[model samples]
Target chain A: VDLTVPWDDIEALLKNNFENDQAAVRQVMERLQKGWSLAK
Target chain B: SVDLTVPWDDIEALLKNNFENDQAAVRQVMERLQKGWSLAK
Candidate 1:
């Protein structure tokens, strides 16, 4: 299944969810980017 | 070896909380993410 990564939306969601932990947000984003890159 | 583990539960909760009025978009994004992660696996 072809899927596009909605980075902006996901980032916003992450930031909103982890408002107190920017580090967690960045970690999630990095992991996601690595996974997406490998998947591609 | 790269780890492909994703905090899906947290993500779902986040989306549900933020996009409560847009369930369709939330579902779509979730599906896309699952597919992407599966491909990575």
Candidate 2:
């Protein structure tokens, strides 16, 4: 259920990522999907 | 910083493996506290 939101792209800052990045990915995915589904 | 300290892991695991399961009870008792008799040793 990907929404029509204009997503902000995080470019050129790849090296600053770590295991916390993976944690961020999971965290953001859940919150986005939750709010998106609710807004739908 | 690993030291010749008695492993705090023992204490930490004791707490973690029993954390907050009943934080709001009338008593601050570690329920079934008798089970972890090894903590005394």
Candidate 3:
């Protein structure tokens, strides 16, 4: 399970969902501080 | 390396380019990533 985040795809999804809300965007950044892992 | 399964840097660069609200953009990214990772696993 090599699951990698396609940054462009994810960004597109988020942007469309939130209409480019910066506040929400920043919140996501904080959540990412822990970092994401994938099943290899 | 932990298998290089996630495109961590690509994400940062993506946000830095598109969003004006850096803080908000990053925070939301982290939130979604956590959730996605959990779901995937």
lDDT, candidate 1, B1-41, per-residue tens: 32334557667776676666478867876765666565544
> Global lDDT of each model?
0.64, 0.32, 0.52
Residue A22, candidate 3: alpha-carbon lDDT: 77
| Candidate 2 runs further than 4 Å off | A3-20, B1-41
Candidate 1, residues A1-40: lDDT per residue as tens digits?
A: 2234456667877787777488988887775666556543
Best by lDDT: 1
| CAPRI rating of model 2 | incorrect
Lowest summed lDDT across 10 adjacent residues in model 2 chain A is found at A6-15
Query: TM-score of the candidate numbered 2?
Result: 0.28
Better of 1 and 3 by TM-score: 1
Q: What DockQ does model 2 achieve? A: 0.02
Give the clashing residue pairs of candidate 2, or none.
none
Order of candidates by lDDT, top first? 1, 3, 2
lDDT by residue for model 3 (A1-40), tens: 1134344466555555566887775555334433454322
What is the Å distance of residue B36 in model 3 from its true position?
1.3
Residue B1, candidate 3: how far off, in angstroms? 12
